């Protein structure tokens, strides 16, 4: 299952069950918050 | 973990103008189909799985194919260890400037039994030593040199006919990430090696036959497959449209932005 | 020892396998991780971010910068003709195949989600006009009249201070996941831009204004089946 | 309003009346290297205003036929004040650059610039076999212009369509990007933090990023409009920290 | 388990003189970069892992390569079991005078199928008996002698084409440590065998083919790889700069202290 | 029995594997462990301990004892010239490659930490002088003037009763781990010793005094990637 | 002060005025073999002062051209009092030696001695093929001098650069080492405990360690200074325990 | 994981997770304590 049989951390199965996502790094990189429901100016 | 569900929408005549944005801001609009148009409440059970960089790099792809023979420098295969040798995984790794990935190499080695005048002598199962020399380490010059004594260099010593050899490698870059793209010269005088070749010097991989010799020439092909795992992509990049020309530099021949269509209004079918 | 029966999948190198393997260098002290800005934990993030698309990919213009430029003019001629037209599916459509969502689509075989095309009017500040950017769902012919495009999903872009209207294709599909490869069953619709009103310009402003289309992925967007990209072709050893 | 902006990094200040929201590089504001993420044991030299100020580079005329320009930072900041002096007198340097590209154009000017900070924009040689010299890509004095078509020789592939890195220029918006559309914007500010694998790197051998200003819509103005439309890059390193005081490198 | 973090420092004009030490004391200065110079607070997440003697010896390296044939004393390979035969692991083990390590031998055996006039006869999978005769035990003289009956001698009986044989060996030295360096004569008269040969007499390793004979000569190469584990290094020594000449003595040819440079002020680049 | 699927890493001899193996002699009574003084549980301990380095490795002097001897003199000639100069990186620098830290560095591919060079004045007890031992971080030319060395990291060694000043290179690197092998990217700085003041000697003391440099590892020092040492070359069977 | 020292092991005492801190061998003080770590069942003979005293060996003149000397202990202590007598009359012996090398030089003398106790310094033969006799390395009466260059014959390789063990002499500081720098030190004391794999070993066949005194900086004195600068080794075994009373071996 | 499948102690995985270190045996072997912030004498 998820048991790691090798002591080294790199010698483990890929973390394919991690679906963390932060698109705001690329889609919303502006300093001032931009709301879609207001003019962008 | 599923993607955001399409919220129900209706007719709207307001000052919100969700569709009206500004690309001048550099911010991609966070609008949804419910914003611009009128959409039904759709619960999106679709998930951004297999699109994760962890899952995307999970697919193991070849990075090094070479032919080393049994019975000079052609009896063992030398690999300056870089993902850029094979274009298939290189463009995947070149989607991000920095990737902190524990790389899982899975060597696939198949003997060829080169066509010769005499091939009636059957050699026993060929063992293969895939030694890894760290950068600056002793590089072997012969198939029987002292470097093959793996006092410190890791080596699978894989035997043919068994499961393909696989030795997971940790993050070994001197920096905090693997710079797939590095617009920097090797020397501070800004003269030398420009590109990923500078920072991505992760040693060499020497592949040989543990068997001393064979009655007839056998040229086993070492097909190194690199599976990145525990990846930390840090600066995304577009795929390289141009075909890869050099494995030590980003040098490219100019290529069209896209497949040209007959007209700006040309919609097939 | 322990009686172990080898499964018929033993001694195989499956490419997409979550199998633990012995470490090459055990207890290797990896360089400490630093917070490098922009951590990509999913490539649908780079799909979501805008990307200028080569709408005007007519022969020769792909080499130059005019591939992305969508030409508009203050002329009565060809006003009843689309500003542009192309296929919605980013997988195989010439316009959208090499863009950020398309490039992260041809690395996959199935795609689902709402493509949003942000259209930036790169013309004179006093150049005001109304366009009709319309996604027509498949099953019918490509819109040849502005009324036909209006019958499908559409947004009227009133060019002004914002200068960017986002045409969000509302995932009008008969299946949960359209196929990236060109297949008529999961064939997407047609995105066509027309003139709802001419691009009225003052006498001191150029008539031949330019428009840039930014095809971007929404929060709905996802890809399901990974595949080697057809774009990256390697003729031989580098 | 969001159009007005004012950045007072260091002695020099930039005030704009039509400037969209500033693109923080990848959503993370630049900061000094933390002790957790620091690998150099030297005492960091941190000039808060001596080096962290707006440096106005050479202004390049945005011609109708101009395909694009690129600046290679921080090497483009050589011979530019105490930031360049600290570059010369330090082995390792880190800085978060809030580039501000000023393109003052009238309301009758048609054009659009993708001002994009590409981290580690490895440039391709014009002839793939050889490698270009440092002068071809370095931007010490003047921006290096992207050519409209393919060029040959021991130079940098300046094909604007491929952005010089074999990468679709329209996809360059994947990097921290801001658009100067003369319809709306006359200036773009990208606050790009220090972006590199190593927490601190030499500022000569390695260019932390490249500011590529790509006119996607070429400048279009009718007769009588100002023909000399300048594209002026005003880049301000922020939280600039240097380790390894050494002999000046020239 | 990480290394000590670089504590923050500042300007100092005091009588502490941390830089001023005395090598006459024989004590290496415990100074830090914060002491001599002014350093920022750097949290050193770097760890002295893979530098541990346990990890350093973890890399398995060859110690014995020999060719024994199928179809006299050339049909089986005899190894006076010592780490010193191969220089790669010998210098690692010679970094310490005494190492109490449980040694993990991993025999890698590859058949060669010696080139002859006739090699058209295919022999079945060759089994290999790697017998260990403890010091003073019965040493075989033939490939079919009674000694090969392993009543007490451990033997893997490894078969070709399978996973490489591996039999972990405990600490078998008569003393409390393996004296890699032993400046002592075998006899109390101070006459006899000088060096590690005296104390490091850990028996012999006889490798043979379990198969009685083959139609054609097959000379399998036994490549013994020694992986020390549970190591207890007890007296550190410098690496031997001179190349190893004898496997039974430290005898050496004189070698330069380092690579000579053009001048005391010669700094390349 | 138990269904077992063999991973693609099965039946391989990885050198750096933590795999349990059957005992050659089961229940073997190992000789009882005794507290032998000096238990090395890490070779960075032998790196940390001082080691005379061959600074004066000019041709021929490596054979003799003068390789370690750093010559200093009470002469006005060549006072504006470095006492010595060499590369900081112990991996490939000729001076530091065969020393304790260097020898325990070329057994590895990556190295991180503060090298500390303890300089012992092996001259007359009344021979007093001031030296300027300077580590210059890379990115600039090797110091050719004492001012250039002063511009980098440096310590003034006032030779006296202590007679040993430790120049601790404060790990001025752009990466968490410099590479032991010679590569310009992780190329280290330059350690140069100059005369801050002449080596003033009484008339009864020799002018040509000697200095010994002890390159030692600090608590920060670590190595990350093991590799076979290039120094130990075996031409053939011993 | 740390420079003054006084060691009163046994009847003989050593008092020094310029002597740095004594180098306890590998940080562990010598002691009698504990019952836990003892493998010999004979009653241990433990002369507290009869054998555990300072024995002053032959003083060797430190010439300008002297490359080095070595003493092989405990065999160098043969014919030296009751320690040597107990060596002769016992099969197994253990001792922790606090060697004290005395090099009295004036303030005008330039030189430095690496006085290093190398445990199990296996010496290499001058001709690699053969093995040297016992006389070549044994130090019963006079120190065996390291040659400045390579020598040949059935002797010990005395190349000072290789320390006679194929090992970098500058790296010999890895073993318990103290420096006699005539600038500061005139005497070095190394309290080396019993260092061997076996808890007790014969004191003739096996030399527990070798005291190598290597002049790294050769003795340099101007005319008029004392030319006969002696290097006097005064080694005191501590906690000396012997098992196996037997016929005297000669 | 860390489970030992073989009865003999030597027949176990290497103790690669032990990073114990005492440099004071070699770097600080002097009998009298030497502090860097005071003259060594
Ligand atoms: C056979 C056992 C050891 C295996 C070592 C081979 C792999 C070495 C490490 C590769 C690092 C990642 C690839 C190069 C860096 C990059 O460009 O991302
Ligand atoms: C085939 C099963 C039995 C295997 C026995 C072979 C290994 C014998 C023990 C080797 C001890 C360590 C090496 C010699 C001593 C040394 O010099 O360190």
Author numbering:
A (entry chain D), H (entry chain D): 28 to 68
B (entry chain A), E (entry chain A): 6 to 76, 81 to 278
C (entry chain C), F (entry chain C): 1 to 238
D (entry chain B), G (entry chain B): 10 to 259
Please share text taken word for word from the publication where this structure appeared.
Echovirus 18 (E18), as a member of enterovirus species B, is a significant causative agent of aseptic meningitis and viral encephalitis in children. We describe the mechanism for the entry of certain EV-B serotypes by using FcRn as a two-in-one attachment-and-uncoating receptor.
Detailed characterizations of mature E18 particles, the E18/FcRn complex under physiological conditions (pH 7.4), and the E18/FcRn complex under acidic conditions (pH 5.5) were performed. To investigate whether soluble FcRn could induce E18 virion uncoating in vitro, E18 mature particles were incubated with FcRn under either neutral (pH 7.4) or acidic (pH 5.5) conditions at 37°C, and the virion morphologies were then compared by negative-stain electron microscopy. When incubating mature E18 particles with FcRn-decorated liposomes at acidic pH, the particles are first bound to the liposomes and then transformed into empty particles and released from the FcRn-decorated liposomes. When the pH of the complex was reduced to pH 5.5, rotation of the residues around the hydrophobic pocket that play a key role in stabilizing the pocket factor was observed. The rotation of these residues further displaced the pocket factor from the pocket of VP1. The release of the pocket factor was further accelerated when the pH was lowered.
